[PDB]
Amino acid sequence: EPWTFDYGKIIKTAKILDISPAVIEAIGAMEGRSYADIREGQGAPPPPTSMDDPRLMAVDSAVRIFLYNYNCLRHVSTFNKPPIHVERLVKHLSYEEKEDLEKVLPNVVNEYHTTFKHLRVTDPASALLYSIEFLCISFLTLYEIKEPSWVVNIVREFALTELNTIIQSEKLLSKPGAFNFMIFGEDFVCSGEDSSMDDISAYSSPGLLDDPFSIEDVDISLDVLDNLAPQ
Amino acid sequence: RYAVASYGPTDALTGQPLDGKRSHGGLRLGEMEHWVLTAQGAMQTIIEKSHDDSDGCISYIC
Amino acid sequence: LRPQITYGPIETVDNEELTEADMLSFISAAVNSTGLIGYNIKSFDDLMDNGIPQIVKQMFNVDITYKDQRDHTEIDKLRESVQIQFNFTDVNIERPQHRNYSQGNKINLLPNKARLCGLSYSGPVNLAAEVILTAHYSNGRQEVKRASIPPFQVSTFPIMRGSNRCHTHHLSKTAKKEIGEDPNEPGGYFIARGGEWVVDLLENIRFNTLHIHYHNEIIRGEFISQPGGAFENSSQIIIRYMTTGAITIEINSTKFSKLRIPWYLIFRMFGMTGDDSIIEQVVFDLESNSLVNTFMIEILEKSIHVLDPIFQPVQHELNREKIIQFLSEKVSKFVSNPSAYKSDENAVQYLNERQLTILDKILLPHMGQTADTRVRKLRFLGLLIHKILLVIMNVFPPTDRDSYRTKRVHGSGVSLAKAFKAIFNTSVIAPIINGFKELLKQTAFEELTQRNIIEAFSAALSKNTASDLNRSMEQSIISGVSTQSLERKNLLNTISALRTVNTHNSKQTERADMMRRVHASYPGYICVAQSADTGEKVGMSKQLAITANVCTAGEVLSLKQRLLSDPAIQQLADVSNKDIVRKGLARVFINGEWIGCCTNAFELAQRYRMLRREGKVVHPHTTIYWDSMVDEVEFWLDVGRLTRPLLIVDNNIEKYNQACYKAAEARKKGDKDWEKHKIPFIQNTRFTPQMAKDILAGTLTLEDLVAQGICEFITPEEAENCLVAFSIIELRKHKHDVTRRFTHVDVPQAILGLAALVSPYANCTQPARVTYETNQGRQTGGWYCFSWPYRVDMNRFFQFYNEMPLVKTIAHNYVIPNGLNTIVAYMIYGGYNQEDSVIVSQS
Amino acid sequence: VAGGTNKSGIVRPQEIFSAKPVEAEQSSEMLLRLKNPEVETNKTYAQEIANSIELITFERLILQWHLLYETYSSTKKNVMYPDFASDVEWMTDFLENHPLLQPPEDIANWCIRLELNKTTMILKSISLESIINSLRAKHPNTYIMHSVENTASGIPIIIRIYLRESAFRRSTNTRMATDEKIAVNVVDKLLNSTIRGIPGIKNANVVKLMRHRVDAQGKLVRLDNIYAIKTNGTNIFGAMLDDNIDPYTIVSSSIGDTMELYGIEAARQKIISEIRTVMGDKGPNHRHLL
Amino acid sequence: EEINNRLLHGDIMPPIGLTTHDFYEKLQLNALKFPDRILKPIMNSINPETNGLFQMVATGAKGSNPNMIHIMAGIGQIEINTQRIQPQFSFGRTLVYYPRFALEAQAYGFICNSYIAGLTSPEFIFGEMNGRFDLINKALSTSSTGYANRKAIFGLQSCIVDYYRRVSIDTRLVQQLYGEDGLDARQLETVRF
Amino acid sequence: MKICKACSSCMVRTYVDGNIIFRCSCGESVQGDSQNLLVSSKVYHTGEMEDKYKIFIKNAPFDPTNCQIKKDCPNCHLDYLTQICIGSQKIIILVCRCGYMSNRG
Ligand SMILES: [Mg+2]
Ligand SMILES: [Zn+2]
Numbered sequence A: 001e002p003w004t005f006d007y008g009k010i011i012k013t014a015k016i017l018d019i020s021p022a023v024i025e026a027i028g029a030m031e032g033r034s035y036a037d038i039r040e041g042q043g044a045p046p047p048p049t050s051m052d053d054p055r056l057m058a059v060d061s062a063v064r065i066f067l068y069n070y071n072c073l074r075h076v077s078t079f080n081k082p083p084i085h086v087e088r089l090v091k092h093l094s095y096e097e098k099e100d101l102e103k104v105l106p107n108v109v110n111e112y113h114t115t116f117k118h119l120r121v122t123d124p125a126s127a128l129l130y131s132i133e134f135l136c137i138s139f140l141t142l143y144e145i146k147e148p149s150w151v152v153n154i155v156r157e158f159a160l161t162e163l164n165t166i167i168q169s170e171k172l173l174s175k176p177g178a179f180n181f182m183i184f185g186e187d188f189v190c191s192g193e194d195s196s197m198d199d200i201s202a203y204s205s206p207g208l209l210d211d212p213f214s215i216e217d218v219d220i221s222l223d224v225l226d227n228l229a230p231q
Numbered sequence B: 001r002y003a004v005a006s007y008g009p010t011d012a013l014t015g016q017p018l019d020g021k022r023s024h025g026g027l028r029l030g031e032m033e034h035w036v037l038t039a040q041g042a043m044q045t046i047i048e049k050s051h052d053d054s055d056g057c058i059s060y061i062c
Numbered sequence C: 001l002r003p004q005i006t007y008g009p010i011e012t013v014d015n016e017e018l019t020e021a022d023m024l025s026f027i028s029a030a031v032n033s034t035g036l037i038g039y040n041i042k043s044f045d046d047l048m049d050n051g052i053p054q055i056v057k058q059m060f061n062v063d064i065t066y067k068d069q070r071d072h073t074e075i076d077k078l079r080e081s082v083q084i085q086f087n088f089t090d091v092n093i094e095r096p097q098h099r100n101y102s103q104g105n106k107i108n109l110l111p112n113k114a115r116l117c118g119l120s121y122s123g124p125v126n127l128a129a130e131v132i133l134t135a136h137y138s139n140g141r142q143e144v145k146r147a148s149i150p151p152f153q154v155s156t157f158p159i160m161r162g163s164n165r166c167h168t169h170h171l172s173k174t175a176k177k178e179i180g181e182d183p184n185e186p187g188g189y190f191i192a193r194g195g196e197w198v199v200d201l202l203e204n205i206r207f208n209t210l211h212i213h214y215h216n217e218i219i220r221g222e223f224i225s226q227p228g229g230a231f232e233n234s235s236q237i238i239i240r241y242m243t244t245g246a247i248t249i250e251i252n253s254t255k256f257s258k259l260r261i262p263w264y265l266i267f268r269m270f271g272m273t274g275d276d277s278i279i280e281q282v283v284f285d286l287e288s289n290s291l292v293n294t295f296m297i298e299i300l301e302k303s304i305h306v307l308d309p310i311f312q313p314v315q316h317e318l319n320r321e322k323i324i325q326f327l328s329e330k331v332s333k334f335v336s337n338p339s340a341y342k343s344d345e346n347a348v349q350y351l352n353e354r355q356l357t358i359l360d361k362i363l364l365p366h367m368g369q370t371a372d373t374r375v376r377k378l379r380f381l382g383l384l385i386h387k388i389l390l391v392i393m394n395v396f397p398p399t400d401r402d403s404y405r406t407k408r409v410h411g412s413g414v415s416l417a418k419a420f421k422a423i424f425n426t427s428v429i430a431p432i433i434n435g436f437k438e439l440l441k442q443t444a445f446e447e448l449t450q451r452n453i454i455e456a457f458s459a460a461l462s463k464n465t466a467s468d469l470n471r472s473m474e475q476s477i478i479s480g481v482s483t484q485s486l487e488r489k490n491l492l493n494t495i496s497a498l499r500t501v502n503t504h505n506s507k508q509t510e511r512a513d514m515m516r517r518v519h520a521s522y523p524g525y526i527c528v529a530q531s532a533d534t535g536e537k538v539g540m541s542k543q544l545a546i547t548a549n550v551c552t553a554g555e556v557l558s559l560k561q562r563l564l565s566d567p568a569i570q571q572l573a574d575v576s577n578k579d580i581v582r583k584g585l586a587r588v589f590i591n592g593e594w595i596g597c598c599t600n601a602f603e604l605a606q607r608y609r610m611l612r613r614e615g616k617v618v619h620p621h622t623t624i625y626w627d628s629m630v631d632e633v634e635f636w637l638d639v640g641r642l643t644r645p646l647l648i649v650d651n652n653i654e655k656y657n658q659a660c661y662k663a664a665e666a667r668k669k670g671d672k673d674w675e676k677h678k679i680p681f682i683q684n685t686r687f688t689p690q691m692a693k694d695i696l697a698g699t700l701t702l703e704d705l706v707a708q709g710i711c712e713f714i715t716p717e718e719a720e721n722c723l724v725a726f727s728i729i730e731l732r733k734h735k736h737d738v739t740r741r742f743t744h745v746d747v748p749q750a751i752l753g754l755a756a757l758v759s760p761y762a763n764c765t766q767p768a769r770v771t772y773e774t775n776q777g778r779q780t781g782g783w784y785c786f787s788w789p790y791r792v793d794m795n796r797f798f799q800f801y802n803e804m805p806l807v808k809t810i811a812h813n814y815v816i817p818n819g820l821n822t823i824v825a826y827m828i829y830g831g832y833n834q835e836d837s838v839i840v841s842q843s
Numbered sequence D: 001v002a003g004g005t006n007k008s009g010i011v012r013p014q015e016i017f018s019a020k021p022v023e024a025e026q027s028s029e030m031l032l033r034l035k036n037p038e039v040e041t042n043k044t045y046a047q048e049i050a051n052s053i054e055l056i057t058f059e060r061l062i063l064q065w066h067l068l069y070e071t072y073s074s075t076k077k078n079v080m081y082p083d084f085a086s087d088v089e090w091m092t093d094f095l096e097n098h099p100l101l102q103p104p105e106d107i108a109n110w111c112i113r114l115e116l117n118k119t120t121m122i123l124k125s126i127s128l129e130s131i132i133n134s135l136r137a138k139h140p141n142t143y144i145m146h147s148v149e150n151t152a153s154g155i156p157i158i159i160r161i162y163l164r165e166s167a168f169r170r171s172t173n174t175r176m177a178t179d180e181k182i183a184v185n186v187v188d189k190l191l192n193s194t195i196r197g198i199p200g201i202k203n204a205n206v207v208k209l210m211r212h213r214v215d216a217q218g219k220l221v222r223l224d225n226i227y228a229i230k231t232n233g234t235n236i237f238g239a240m241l242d243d244n245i246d247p248y249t250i251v252s253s254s255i256g257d258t259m260e261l262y263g264i265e266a267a268r269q270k271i272i273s274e275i276r277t278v279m280g281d282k283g284p285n286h287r288h289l290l
Numbered sequence E: 001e002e003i004n005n006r007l008l009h010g011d012i013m014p015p016i017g018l019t020t021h022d023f024y025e026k027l028q029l030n031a032l033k034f035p036d037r038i039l040k041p042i043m044n045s046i047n048p049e050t051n052g053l054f055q056m057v058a059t060g061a062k063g064s065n066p067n068m069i070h071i072m073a074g075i076g077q078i079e080i081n082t083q084r085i086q087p088q089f090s091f092g093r094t095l096v097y098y099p100r101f102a103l104e105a106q107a108y109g110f111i112c113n114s115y116i117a118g119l120t121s122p123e124f125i126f127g128e129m130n131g132r133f134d135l136i137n138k139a140l141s142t143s144s145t146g147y148a149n150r151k152a153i154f155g156l157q158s159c160i161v162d163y164y165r166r167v168s169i170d171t172r173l174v175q176q177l178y179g180e181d182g183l184d185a186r187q188l189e190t191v192r193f
Numbered sequence F: 001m002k003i004c005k006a007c008s009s010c011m012v013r014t015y016v017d018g019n020i021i022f023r024c025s026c027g028e029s030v031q032g033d034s035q036n037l038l039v040s041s042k043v044y045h046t047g048e049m050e051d052k053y054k055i056f057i058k059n060a061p062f063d064p065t066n067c068q069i070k071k072d073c074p075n076c077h078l079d080y081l082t083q084i085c086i087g088s089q090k091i092i093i094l095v096c097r098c099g100y101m102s103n104r105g
C-alpha cells in the first residue's frame, strides 16, 4: 500500500478547533518559540533529516497518549475506578451500558506503530508528517461517528478534550510571556543559564569502619616513628 | 636528643607538661608503658612518674 | 585517508652492533624532549593563557531575579522584580607586582623578595564586563538598563615560578643566578607567605567512561561526562540496581543533588515514552532470541513495575510535559508552595523551559548540550545500562579500580582551575549580587544612571573581595588540589616531589591494601620501586618513570571531523540499533563520545595507527585503543594521559605468509623441494647504532625520531594492544621467532624512576632494598640548593663536599650526586658495628 | 586468601577474639577420623569416603533452568513453550519406560525445565539415576520426568519437574503469596537440595597424621600410616550422623560449633587450641592461652 | 613445559573437587621448586672453612639457606598468597612483556636468575610485586596488632592473682589456680619423663 | 514480556483459571498463546559460555597480543596458529586468520 501525505485532514481538523493549521503542524517543535509566532507559523524548523531527531519522538508521544486515553474510555468497565479525564462525563451512565462502549466504539490503532517504526528508519521526514496526519484522521474518525445515538455526545466531547490537551501540553513547552516571578513562593528566581547559585561542592570531581593502616590504638610518640621502620 | 628538667611549662587545662621537645615540655609515658609497669608490678614508679612528676594533686571528698 | 609513506625493508637494518649502553641514548633523548617537570610549566601556561579566560568568559554568566522590597511609589507599587544579568568579556593576568614605598607605580616583585619578606608571588587579574538590569512591572512591561564597565583589577592570582607569568622567564641564567635564584633549578612551585609549595599530580578516574562497581544496591555504575576540555564543567550519572529490582538513574551536578529517578522516566522526558522503544535502547533488539536478551528483558520488565515513593504520581503517566513539570517543581529551590503558580500558564511554561534548558546542558553534556541530540543521548544512555547489566549477569568483570587504563593524572592547571571555579563565584560573583541588591533597595530602578551602575559593581568588589580571592587560592595551595610544602633536602628530592602522583586517599580492609601494591599497568609509567617504606604512606605516593610524561589536550575537532568524513565510518544518524547487532557493527568512540560505527574494528585502528606514524594527519599524542573483547575502537586526546616513547618493532609477516602459501602450493603439485619457497621470519627495530651516536651529538631528537616512524608514544590503555620486548636482547633472541611477534621494544631502565636509578646494580639488589634507596636518597645531605646564602630556611643542611660515584648511573646526568666515596671495610672490628652500626674514622 | 580458606592478615585471630559465629568464619576446617582402624590404613578407602562427604547441591549440576506455566497430560495435547516443544519426543519414551511412574491427577500449571551440565556430571561422577532418587526422596509434592542418559555429545540431559497441587496446599492460608511466588520458592528448594554429601563442607581432602597407641606389651609407639579427612567448612552434626566417621573424635576448628554441640568446657579447650595454631611454634607459654 | 603439553592435548584430568585451572596451577607450583640438589653446585663453589657468607648462615649468626640460593643459584617462583602471579593486565596477560594466555612459567613470576647474576625487567617487576607485600604487611604488623593488643588487655587486665593463687575479677573466679599449676612462666624447666 | 498494541507499554502478567492473561494500564487485555509461557529463567556459568567469547575468538587471530603456537593450519597451511585458553576448565582453542578454528566451530 502506497502511503501519501494528506494536507486536507489537517485543514479540516484545524477548522474544527478554531486554531491555525500551523499549530497542528508544529507538534514537538514549539520549544523555544513564542506561541504567537507558532500560531502564524513563523520560524518553523525544516523537515527532519536524521532518524534521531527528537521531533519524531515528540510527535509520536503525542499520538500514543491520544491512543492511551482513548482505550481507557474504551475499557472503562475493567477499571476499578475510571481516571479523572474520562469519569466526569460518563458518570451519568449505567453499568450495563458502561460495560458497553467497547463494542460500539471502533479501534483507531490499526497499523500506526508498525508503520511509524518503518518510516522512522527509512525516511525521517515522512515519519513526522505521518504521525501528525494519523492524529488528525483519528480525531476525524471519532468526530464523524454518527451511530448509535447514545454515543455521539460522549465521544465527540472526548475527541475535542483529548486533542486540546495534546495541543495545550505542547503549548506549555513554548517560550513563556510575562508573569509575576514571585508567585513561586521565594525571593530569588534563577534561570537555566545561571551560575551564581550553583553547588560549590559540585565544581570538584563528582562522587567520592576501622582504618587498617592507622596507628590509633598504638600509643607511640609521633617523633619516634622510626622504631617502626622495617629495617 | 632531649632531656628537660624536674619542672617546666605546664598545660593550662590538665596541669600536665607540654608536648615534646619543641614546647620545652616533657616526654610521654603513654598507655602502653603503664601496661608494662603494671605487668612488672612497678606501682611506686607509676606514682613517681604519673603523679609526682606529671599532675598529682590532693582531692578532698566528703 | 589511507597511509602512503613507506620505509626501508626490515631485512636491511643493521642492529647487530647495538649495546644496552647505546640504548641509554634513547632515554637521554626522551628526557631531553620531555624535560623533567615540563608538564607542570605547560599546564600552568595553558591555565593562564587559555584556561582561566575561558572559564570566566563562558562558565560565569549571571542571570538572577530578585523581589523589589521597596516601599510605596507610583513606579514602586507597580513593579515587583528586578533581573540582574551580567557576564565578563575581557580577562587577563599580569606578572607579579609590588608597590615600592607608598603611592608608587607597582614595580616588579622578584621571587627572592617575596620569599624574604613573606610576600605573595601573585600577579594581578584584570576583568571587564557588561551588566544588564531588567525591572518588571505589574502591568506587564519591563525596563532594561545596560552598562559596559571599563576593565579593572579584582585581585591577584598565584603565579608558578618559572612559568610564562614569572619574572624568572625574561631573564638569562646569569641574571637568575645573581638575583638570589637557583640557575640550575627548573622551578614549578608557588611562593606564598614566604613558603614554597608544590601542587602535586592527582590520580583521577577517566572521564566519559563507565565505572562499574559492586556494593541496598546490588550493583552500581558511575559515569562522569565532560563536554570537551580540561576546564569544562563535569556532570556524573549513577545508575543503581537495587535488590527490589528497580533501576534508578541519579544525576549529581551543580543543579541536581542526590535525586534518584527511575530509569524510564529519563527516557520519557525526552519525548520517547513508548516502553517498547525504551527497552530497545538497552537490548538493541526486541526480536533477538539470544539468551542474553532474555536476562536483559526480564530485569527490565520487572524494573518498570516497581513503585517509587518519590516519583509515584508520574510513574504511570505518558505525558512528557507533566513529567518535566513534576521534576521542575521538585528540583527548583525557589518553589515553596505548589499549585500557587499552576493557575498562571506562563509560570508553567517558564518552569518547563528552564528544566529543558538545564537537562540538555547537564545530562551527558559530552554528547552535546543542545536539544538536537536528545535522542542521541538516549541511545548512549541505554548503552550504559546495557553494559551494567552485563556485569550483573557476570558476563564481564567490574572495573578494576587500580589499573591505569581508566585513570588520569591531573597537574596544577586542572587542579587550580577546579579550585578557581568554587572561589570565583563566592568571592567575586556573590559580592556583586549583594552589591546590586543593596543598590536597587536604596534607589529606584528608573533613577539609576550609567554612572551609578558602574560604581556599585566596582565598590562591591572592595579589598575584602580582593583579599578573599587571592588568599582563598593560597589556602587551597597551602591546605591542600593536593599540595605539599617544598622541602629542599637536595636536588633529587626537589625533582622527585614535582614528579609525584598523589591519590584521593578508603577504610575497607581489602581496598586499602590493593591500592598500595604495584599494579601490572605501572611498568613504564609509574616507578615500580619508589614508595614509602614505613607507616601509613606505604604505596600511597607514586613516582613517574624516567621516560613517562603527561600529555595535554589535543585538537579533537580535527580528528572528529575526519572520522565523520571517513567513508569506512557510518554516522550515528545513519545506523539503527537493529543495524548494529544484526550486522555486527563496531562502535567508535572519541574522548568517550559515541560518534558512529564501522564494519571492521581491527582495520580501522590499524589504519589510523599507521596514519599516526606520519604525524601529518593524526597527532602523535593520540591514543588509539581497540577492544577485542567487545569489538570497539576508542580514540583519546584528553589531558592527563601518561605516555612513554616505545621503539616500534617491524617484521616481514606479510612476505612470510606468502612464502608459506607458495610452499604449500608447490607441495600440492607434487614438487619435492617445496621447502625452498619459504623465507625466514625477521622482526627488528629501526634504531641503528648511528642513530645513538647522532642523539649524543645533538643532531637527533625524540621529535624527529617520532617523525621518521621509529618510536611512538604509548598510553596505558593503548599499552594493552602492545606486546613489548623488555630489552634489545630479547628482541634479538626472538629475531626469527614467528610465534612471538613483538609490537615494540623497550629500554629496560625506562621502568624505574629518577630516585630509583641512583642505586647501582639495582637489579642485583633485593627489590625491597631498591625502595629504601628511593626514600634514603631523597633525605641525603648535600648541596640542597645552589642559592643557599640568599635563603633563610628552616632545618636545612648544606654538606660541603660531594663526589660523583666511582660507579655512577644515568640518574646522575640530571641531578647532583650527594655523598662521598668512603673507603669501607667489611669486617668484624671489636663488636662496635654490630646490629647495623658502623665504625667511623675520627680523622 | 581465597574464599573458604582466608588465612590472610589478621582474620582468624579476629574470628577467635571477637567470638564471631560459625556463619562468619572464612577459614573453618574440620578433621574426621574413620570409624574402622583397618579402613584408615588404606588410602583408597579414605579417598572414596572423603569424596563421599562433599556438598554437591543440585544447583551446581544445572547449566540453566526454565520455569514454565504448563500442565502435563499423557493424552490431552496441552500448550507447550515453542522453544521447548521438542521435549515431547523423550516424554513418550519416559511414559513407556516407567509403567509405574504415571503422571498424577493433581498436576498444577507449573513446570520447571532443567538442562544438566554434563561436564560436571562427569568430573563429580554423578549419575542421572542418583539425581532422580535424591529429588524424589526429598520432594514428594512434585512429579519428575527425565530424558535418557546419553553418552553422545551435543544431546543434553533434561530434567522436568512438575509441581502438584499439594505444593500450594502446604500453606496457602497465608494469602500474601501468589501462585507465582510459591513456584519461585519451590524451585529455590529444589536447587538447594543435597545430593551425595553432607551440608556445610565444600572440600574434603585426605591427609596423613601421626598418633600414639599402646601396644599389647604396654609400649607407646608412633603410628604414621593413619589416614583421615580434613574438610573445608565445618559441620559437627553433619559428620556426627555419618556411619563412616568416628563421632567421638571429631575435631572442629570452629569455637561456636564446638560450643553449640559439646559445651563450654570443650569450647574452652577449643579456644586454647585455636590460639596456639595462630601463635605458631614461637608462641607464648601454655598458661597464657588458658 | 610438559605440563603445558598435557594441557594442550587435554590430558590433564583434575580429581574430584578441583577444577582444571586449580589442578593445573597446583601442578605448576610443585614442578617449579628447587630440588635439594641445588646446593651441590653452590657448595662446590665455596670453601666452608674460609667463606664468610656461608659461615654466617651455617652457624646461625645471620641468614638462612634460601638466602644463599637466592643470591647464588636463583630466586625461583614468586608466590604471593600461595599462588603464582595472577593476570591483572587486561584479561590473561600478567605484564605488557608477555602475550595473552602465555604458557611459559616466566610469565607467572618464575625468576630464573640469581641476585649475583642480575634480574631482567620482567623479573624485577615480579620481585617488586612480592617486595611491596613485605612493606605493606610490615606497616599492618603495627596498626593491626595494636588494635588486637588493646582490646585483649582491656578485657584481661582485671584478672589478678589473689592470696589463694586463684585468678579472679574483684570477687569472681576466672581460674581456680593460675595456669592450673600455680607457677610462674619465668621459673619453668623443660624435663623429660 | 508483552507490549501493549494500543500504547506500547509493558503489560502486567497475571494467571487466571489455567491461563496467562496480560492486562495493561489502559484497560487492554490479551492472552498469550505459546511464547509467553516463560515465567523466569537463569543461566549458570555465564563467565565461560561460548556466546561470551564469540567476538573475542573471532578477533583473536588479528590481535597481536595473543599467544602463538608452532602448528600447521589444516586449511591455509600456515605454519603458526593462535592459541587461546578460556574458561575455568582451561579449554584450549587454536584459531587462524583464514577462519579455521579448533573444536570444529
Ligand atoms: Mg629500627
Ligand atoms: Zn496499553
Ligand SMILES: [Zn+2]
Binding pocket: F073, F074, F075, F076, F077, F078, F096, F097, F098, F099, F100
Ligand atoms: Zn589458516
